[PDB]
Amino acid sequence: NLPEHWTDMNHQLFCMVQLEPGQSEYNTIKDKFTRTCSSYAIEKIERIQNAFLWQSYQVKKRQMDIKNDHKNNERLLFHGTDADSVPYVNQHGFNRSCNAVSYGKGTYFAVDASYSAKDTYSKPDSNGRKHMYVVRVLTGVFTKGRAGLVTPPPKNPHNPTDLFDSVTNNTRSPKLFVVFFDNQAYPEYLITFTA
Amino acid sequence: NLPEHWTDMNHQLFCMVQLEPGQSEYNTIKDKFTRTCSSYAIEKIERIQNAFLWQSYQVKKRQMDIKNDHKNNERLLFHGTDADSVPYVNQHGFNRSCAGKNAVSYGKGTYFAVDASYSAKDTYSKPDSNGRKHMYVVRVLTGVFTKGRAGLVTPPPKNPHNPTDLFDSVTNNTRSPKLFVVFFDNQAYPEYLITFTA
Ligand SMILES: Clc1ccc2c(c1)sc1nncn12
């Protein structure tokens, strides 16, 4: 059930597709970035077409939509990474086993591109190029995180196995989300950009 | 896509089903266990019916069956654990972030034993306040494997010049595997819980 906006993959299961500047898809993703990163130069935006990651992610989305009994479980967030991690993320997605972990030992996603644009996350390579993903994240029902969490807290210490889906720095005005399970995040676009 | 021999769960997502001695399903698990644990006695065997864990696992199996060249990707292995972990495993499966350091480490993952005798050690199946020990029987996607190393946080690459094309699991010994380590969620389905005592 590979999405409409994807382009033909000649019966293959992984492709990185460079977007055409000035077309609708590129414009939409560029505007999400330039909201907080207008001072950075975009070199390119690639659509990540990973059939296996998409399938595993869509299964978790369907499960979370059933469990939470509504469909506002997904957010579009940013993740900055070093050039050496890009091949792994494109192929395997986000791995909590692989920077600070103040809100728990999971994968960190930013509301604002400006946060992911810090050199500590999007480490400039030899040539000065920085890399940031636009990520579909199943944030679901979230609570405030804390150091040392290995999973989100229970929604009620009466039923200790019924968990929040993610944690955040601030529930009223979140700027980051942490997820603690594989396939709760789909890397959708990779932005290559410079300071 | 739930298996047709599961009990009706009436739109519920999770059920533990107590098996009856004399049924082939109970007896094959008992035989697999007593092959190496004939000194212990089984209190009961429960089939774990977890709709969500089963779906995510079955998706990973289909992917590994596609990726690998007609391999038998799945093994039935043992996992001993403490009473305090059983409700989390029943609901959420095996979380590498919760895993103990194994006395012989082949990587930082979840460990599964070929032999019940290994899982039956008090170090893994810690006896509870009533002297009950707990062991899962687990469908594990071992796929294509190599000898692991204590440093691993994922399985190693098959080819050092293609670092993202990974082995599916690692083992203690490729000629005579006695344990397997997996490093991803939904790579193992807890199928049965054995409750046993001395
Ligand atoms: Cl504390 C923390 C750690 C990692 C991290 C953030 C915040 S925001 C962000 N964007 N990409 C990575 N990250």
Residue numbers in the entry:
A (entry chain A): 481 to 578, 582 to 678
B (entry chain B): 481 to 678
Article excerpt on this structure:
The PARPs and TNKSs form a family of structurally and functionally diverse enzymes, which are involved in the regulation of various key biological and pathological processes such as DNA repair, cell differentiation, gene transcription, and signal transduction pathways. Here, we report our contribution in identifying a set of compounds based on a new nicotinamide mimicking chemotype,triazolo[3,4-b]benzothiazole (TBT), able to inhibit different PARP family enzymes with submicromolar activity depending on the substitution pattern around the central core.
The minor modifications of the C-6 substituent did not result in significant structural changes as observed from the PARP15 crystal structures in complex with 6, 7, and 8, which showed highly similar binding modes to 1.
